[PDB]
């Protein structure tokens, strides 16, 4: 709860890549794509819709951890 509430570009990229890989590996879609044959485009649509079932686990340098949802974080 102490870190920045904004979702960084690195987190955006990693989440989009992981979701695109999962979709290319026959993962279920939660946005009802309309003729999108590109897993990266599908992942971007899911990110814009705020329906990606991924939780970022931010680790502090000391060892503590904190969970942040994609729908909970702020996007740009």
């Amino acid at each position: 709860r102490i870190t920045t509430p904004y979702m960084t570009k690195y987190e955006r990229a990693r989440v989009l890549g992981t979701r695109a890989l999962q979709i290319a590996m026959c993962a279920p879609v939660m946005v009802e794509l309309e003729g999108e044959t590109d897993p990266l485009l599908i992942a971007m649509k899911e990110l814009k819709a705020r329906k990606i079932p991924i939780i970022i686990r931010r680790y502090l340098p000391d060892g503590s951890y904190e969970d942040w949802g994609v729908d909970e974080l702020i996007i740009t």
């Binding site: 502090l60 340098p61 000391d62 503590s64």
Partner: protein, 209 residues
Amino acid sequence: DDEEETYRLWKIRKTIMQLCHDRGYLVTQDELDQTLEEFKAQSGDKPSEGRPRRTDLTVLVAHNDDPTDQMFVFFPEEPKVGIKTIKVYCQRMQEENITRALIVVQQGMTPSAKQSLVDMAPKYILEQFLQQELLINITEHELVPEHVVMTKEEVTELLARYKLRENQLPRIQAGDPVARYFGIKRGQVVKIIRPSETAGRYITYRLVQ
């Protein structure tokens, strides 16, 4: 001579007073703001001024910590201090029951004398200082930021807030000019306040190591 030597002595005395005030010893405002006129009234000639005895100070006491603690300052007259002078100062401090001492050398310290002073005793803490360095106060320099030795409580608060250890803080050598000016030992922490280009200040911390 007789005009620049007295000025150097006055400036060194004022620098020592400022150093004692920064460290926390008891020093009055009159001694802090001591003018060249008063220094002349005390002694206006080089042969009349006494470097080894007339310039020594024994009233410096840590009023904030404990009035019993006493700190002494020696001003050797010879350019190079010898083992005999070091032993004389050591036995004088033993007789007077004093632990902390400073030695304001005139030109330098021989290697043997330096080693002896380093390995004198854990309880007798003697710090060497060159007059060429003391002629100018390091704290008043524009490049040198403001340093404050933090207490154990402040260090514990910092460590608890940042979830860090002692070895993880930026190191600063004990032989640093500011380190010797403040008389900080191994394990202590100093907070440094750097005035940014704006009206703000950047707070950092350094561990003596």
